[PDB]
């Protein structure tokens, strides 16, 4: 009886196996745009993805991860609220069963159709497993998806999903350029938080972009054809794999923009 997104194992149950679920810096949160404070000391984000080396795409039973070679400084995030250099290890999405839900963060209570997380770890800790044990171990760049025009840079991801329909399936996925998933503006909100899936560790500097990307209805429909289950098990569509907003508690959200 392991965690998931169903009626009997979903987010409201996670605290029994992962008591940090009720912790002091849990994610996601609602971003109240009027209460977020502009911080003029925040620097522009530096996204350096030109040498990124994607390797594989994996259905892990909760989402699909596009994985990267993180054994060198090839795709890195720095600047913004961050001290030091953070290496891209994977990206994945959270999405809904309907266009009116799917994101984890919300903006003035608005839910987007999906949310992309680009996960990076602080190179001063040597590897991802050590980084997640540190309060400044990870930096996650969160990008909202709305349904409208297609995102051409997403299509290569969409077209491979048929090969990883069920839990545990992976496929070679080389030469994917994550720059094709970024919006025009890098204006952002930032706050200290957590992983949004178990183990829910409180190790993330969240950087959430204000500008959403647009994807087509056909693109998001293909996300919704994935399966939570493994091959040969009863089919349960991979939809609504999002954790709802958690209490802000003693945190301030900062904005890079006026």
Range of the domain at 95: 1-258
Q: According to the annotation, is 197 in a ligand binding site?
A: yes
Q: According to the annotation, is 174 in a ligand binding site?
A: no
CB 117 within 8 A of CB 157: no
Q: How many domains does the chain have?
A: 1
156-161, Cβ contacts within 8 angstroms, sequence gap of 24 or more:
157/57, 157/66, 158/219, 158/222, 158/223, 160/57, 161/64, 161/222, 161/223, 161/225, 161/226
CB 176 within 8 A of CB 251: no
In which residue are the tokens 């349960």 written? 236
As annotated, the active-site residues are: 62
CB 238 within 8 A of CB 230: no
Interatomic CA distance for residues 258 and 247, integer angstroms:
25
CB 52 within 8 A of CB 177: yes
What is residue 197's three-state secondary structure? coil
Cα dihedral 213/36/10/240 (nearest 10): -20
**What is the DSSP secondary structure assignment for residue 42, as one 8-state letter?**
P
Alpha-helical runs (H) found in the chain: 14-17, 128-131, 155-160, 217-223
Q: According to the annotation, is 205 in a ligand binding site?
A: no
CB 45 within 8 A of CB 207: yes
Q: According to the annotation, is 1 in a ligand binding site?
A: no
**Residues whose CB falls within 8 Å of the CB of residue 133, separated by 6 or more in sequence, listed in order:** 125, 201, 203
Q: Which of 100, 200, 102 is nearest to 142 (CA)?
A: 102
**What resolution in angstrom units was achieved for this structure?**
1.4
Q: According to the annotation, is 120 in a ligand binding site?
A: no
């Amino acid at each position: 009886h392991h965690w998931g997104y169903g009626k009997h194992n979903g987010p409201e149950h996670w605290h029994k196996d992962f008591p940090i679920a009720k912790g002091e810096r849990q994610s996601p949160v609602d971003i109240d745009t009027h209460t977020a404070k502009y911080d003029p000391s925040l620097k522009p984000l530096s996204v350096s993805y030109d040498q990124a080396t994607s390797l594989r795409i994996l259905n892990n039973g909760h989402a699909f991860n596009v994985e990267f070679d993180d054994s060198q400084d090839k795709a890195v995030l720095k600047g913004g609220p961050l001290d030091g250099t953070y290496r891209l290890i994977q990206f994945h999405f959270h999405w809904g069963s309907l266009d009116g839900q799917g994101s984890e963060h919300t903006v003035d209570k608005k839910k987007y159709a999906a949310e992309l997380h680009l996960v990076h770890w602080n190179t001063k800790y040597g590897d991802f497993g050590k980084a997640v044990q540190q309060p400044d171990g990870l930096a996650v760049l969160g990008i909202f998806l709305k349904v409208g025009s297609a995102k051409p840079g997403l299509q290569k991801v969409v077209d491979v999903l048929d090969s990883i329909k069920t839990k545990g399936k992976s496929a070679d996925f080389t030469n994917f350029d994550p720059r094709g998933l970024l919006p025009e503006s890098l204006d952002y909100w930032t706050y200290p938080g957590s992983l949004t899936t178990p183990p829910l560790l409180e190790c993330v500097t969240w950087i959430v972009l204000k500008e959403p990307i647009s994807v087509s209805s056909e693109q998001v429909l293909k996300f919704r054809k994935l399966n939570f289950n493994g091959e040969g098990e009863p089919e349960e569509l991979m939809v609504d794999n999002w954790r709802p907003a958690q209490p802000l508690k003693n945190r301030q959200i900062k904005a890079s923009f006026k």
